[PDB]
């Protein structure tokens, strides 16, 4: 067909450019198609309004979606294959004013998961991070907004840690990609298999490592914490702007600070900044007023260099190509446990940690921005500085 011919090419072009998502959107007069690359959407094509139905058909067919239904959202999955390329897609259709909208999400593979040496950790923090994950039990929290690289990190860790002498059990919503040598369980709300329900079962499963996909309940916060106290390694995900507030979040979710204190081994706060395109990279001579505001001594200010991409055909005008990770790693020690009990605020916990040598998201992004890995713009945007 011609609609079949379009879906093949847009998926192929997405796989070739490492696009995260494909948006097929009807509008007043046309159909716009967009690709998400490096977290940001780009224009790809524009179709005649009549093209919409046939295209939606091709997509819905791939995922076993009902062509008859156009009044309700639908959800499908397809293992898509075209000679060279092989990728799973999650298809989503949504009724819109101008007709159904389709979104195709290209899922990653276990192949794609990095080793912990290739995460982007600075030299000093890397050795601390290597240490905290090597502990035999406790709970290690990874926090940040969606698209922060949190899953990539958690599985990077599990890739180094889940050896055959251990049981590695995972609760996930959904399971994105299957990992060899660990046990994975998928949340099933229709059946009633919730995060809290599966976690309770894990305790009956002789676990060694438990991966909690996401902590939203009080209930899962307690069980995840109880697994930790029981003597297991717990890797879980929380949604917090900061490392320290993960401590306060657990308190508000109802974990008493003495439980938190006896189980929390460390918190990692992750954000994902965009990487300056190499072809169109250009030095910008910077601004002493910022750098001043992130109290970089005025000895490290005129030594400092900053960079931006200019936009070229090789980055679609973006000035960016690929992404990089920035890290705020809070390691729990004997001065911090005491501050968790006694009830210090997140701000107070953080000043202690920083005074021990914790680098913040800002301070990390900046160190990477002074290498031209990313722009100062991107750093202040994803964090708050």
Residues 234 to 273: which contact ligand AGS by CB under 6 A?
237, 272
Strand spans (E) along 173-230: 183-186, 209-212
Q: Residue 376, interface with a copy of itself (CB under 8 A)? A: yes
Name the residue among 216, 226, 213, 236 with its Cα closest to residue 262: 226
Task: Decide the pairing of beta strands 183-186 and 209-212.
Answer: unpaired
Binder of a copy of itself out of 290, 310, 351, 352 (CB under 8 A) = 290
Which of residues 140 and 324 has its CB atom nearest to ligand AGS in the complex?
324
Are 315 and 276 in contact, with CB atoms under 8 Å apart?
Answer: no
Give the bridge partners for 331, in sequence order. Answer: 266
Q: Residue 324, interface with ligand AGS (CB under 6 A)? A: yes
Are 158 and 116 in contact, with CB atoms under 8 Å apart?
Answer: no
Binder of ligand AGS out of 74, 151, 194, 245 (CB under 6 A) = 151
Q: Residue 178, interface with ligand AGS (CB under 6 A)? A: no
Residue 165 makes CB contacts below 8 A (sequence gap 6+) with none
Q: How many residues bind Zn ion (CB under 5 A)?
A: 7
- Give the SS3 label for residue 367: helix
Span 299-338, contacts to a copy of itself by CB under 8 A: 318, 334, 337-338
Contacted by 279, from Zn ion, a copy of itself, ligand AGS, none: CB < 5 to 8 Å by type: Zn ion
Position of tokens 């290597």?
A: 130
Q: How many residues in total does the chain contain?
A: 385
Binder of a copy of itself out of 8, 17, 18, 23 (CB under 8 A) = 23
- Give the SS3 label for residue 3: helix
Dihedral of alpha carbons 263, 266, 267, 270, sign: negative
Q: Count CB-CB contacts under 10 A for residue 345.
A: 13
Q: Select from 132-140, 141-149, 300-308, 341-349 the region that touches ligand AGS (CB under 6 A).
A: 141-149
Q: Select from 57-65, 275-283, 287-295, 323-331 the region that touches a copy of itself (CB under 8 A).
A: 287-295
Position of tokens 């307690």?
A: 222
The least CB distance from residue 360 to a copy of itself, in Å, is: 13
Q: Residue 126, interface with ligand AGS (CB under 6 A)? A: no
Span 54-113, contacts to ligand AGS by CB under 6 A: 77, 107-108, 110-111
Span 290-309, contacts to Zn ion by CB under 5 A: 309
- Give the SS3 label for residue 259: helix
Q: Residue 28, interface with ligand AGS (CB under 6 A)? A: no
Q: Write the Ramachandran bin of 254: left for phi over 0, alpha for psi from -120 to 50, otherwise beta.
A: left
Are 102 and 110 in contact, with CB atoms under 8 Å apart?
Answer: no
Binding mask 206-245 for a copy of itself (x = CB under 8 A): x-x-------x-x---x--xx--xxxx------xx-----
Which of residues 321 and 362 has its CB atom nearest to Zn ion in the complex?
321
Which of residues 344 and 368 has its CB atom nearest to ligand AGS in the complex?
368
Strand spans (E) along 224-348: 233-238, 264-276, 281-284, 306-309, 320-331
Q: Residue 325, interface with ligand AGS (CB under 6 A)? A: yes
The least CB distance from residue 285 to ligand AGS, in Å, is: 28
Q: Residue 280, interface with Zn ion (CB under 5 A)? A: yes
Contacted by 280, from Zn ion, a copy of itself, ligand AGS, none: CB < 5 to 8 Å by type: Zn ion
Tokens (6 digits) for 238: 């929380």
Tokens (6 digits) for 251: 């308190």
Which of residues 10 and 255 has its CB atom nearest to a copy of itself in the complex?
255
- Give the SS3 label for residue 110: helix
Which of residues 43 and 124 has its CB atom nearest to Zn ion in the complex?
43
Binder of a copy of itself out of 3, 294, 312, 352 (CB under 8 A) = 294
Give dist(CA 233, CA 13) in Å, integer: 41
Footprint of Zn ion (CB under 5 A): 277, 279-280, 309, 312, 314-315
Footprint of ligand AGS (CB under 6 A): 77, 107-108, 110-111, 119-120, 144, 146-152, 176, 237, 272, 323-325
């Amino acid at each position: 067909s011609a609609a079949q011919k379009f879906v093949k090419q847009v998926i192929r072009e997405a796989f070739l450019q490492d696009a995260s998502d494909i948006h097929i959107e009807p509008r007043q007069n046309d159909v716009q198609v967009r690709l998400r690359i490096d977290g940001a959407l780009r224009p790809y094509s524009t179709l005649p309004k009549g093209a919409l139905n046939a295209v939606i058909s091709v997509v819905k067919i791939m995922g076993g979606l009902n062509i008859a239904e156009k009044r309700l959202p639908q959800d499908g999955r397809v293992r898509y294959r075209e000679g060279a390329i092989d990728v799973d897609l999650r298809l989503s259709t949504l009724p819109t004013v101008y007709g159904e909208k389709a979104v195709m999400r290209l899922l990653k593979k276990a192949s794609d998961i990095p080793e912990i040496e290739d995460l982007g950790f600075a030299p000093g923090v890397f050795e601390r991070f290597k240490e905290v994950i090597s502990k035999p039990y406790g709970i290690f929290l990874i926090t940040g907004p969606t698209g922060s690289g949190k899953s990539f990190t958690t599985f990077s860790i599990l890739k180094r840690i889940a050896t055959p002498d251990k049981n590695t059990q995972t609760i996930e919503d959904p399971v994105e990609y299957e990992i060899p040598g660990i046990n994975q369980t998928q949340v099933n709300p229709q059946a009633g298999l919730t995060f809290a329900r599966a976690l309770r079962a894990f305790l009956r499963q002789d676990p060694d490592i438990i991966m909690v996909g996401e902590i939203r309940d009080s209930e899962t916060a307690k069980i995840a914490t109880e697994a930790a106290l029981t003597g297991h390694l717990v890797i879980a995900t929380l949604h917090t702007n900061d490392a320290a507030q993960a401590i306060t979040r657990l308190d508000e979710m109802g974990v008493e600070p003495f439980n938190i204190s006896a189980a929390l081994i460390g918190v990692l706060s992750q954000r994902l900044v965009r990487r300056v395109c190499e072809h169109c990279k250009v030095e910008v001579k910077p601004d002493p007023e910022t750098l001043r505001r992130l109290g970089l001594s005025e000895a490290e200010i005129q030594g400092a260099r900053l960079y931006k991409g200019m936009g070229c055909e090789r980055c679609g005008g973006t000035g960016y190509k690929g992404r990089y990770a920035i890290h705020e790693l809070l390691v729990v020690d004997d001065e911090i446990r005491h501050a968790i009990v006694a009830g210090k605020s997140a701000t107070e916990i953080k000043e202690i940690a920083r005074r021990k040598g914790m680098k913040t998201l800002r301070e990390d992004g900046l160190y990477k921005a002074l290498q031209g890995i990313t722009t100062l713009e991107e750093v202040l945007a994803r964090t708050i500085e």
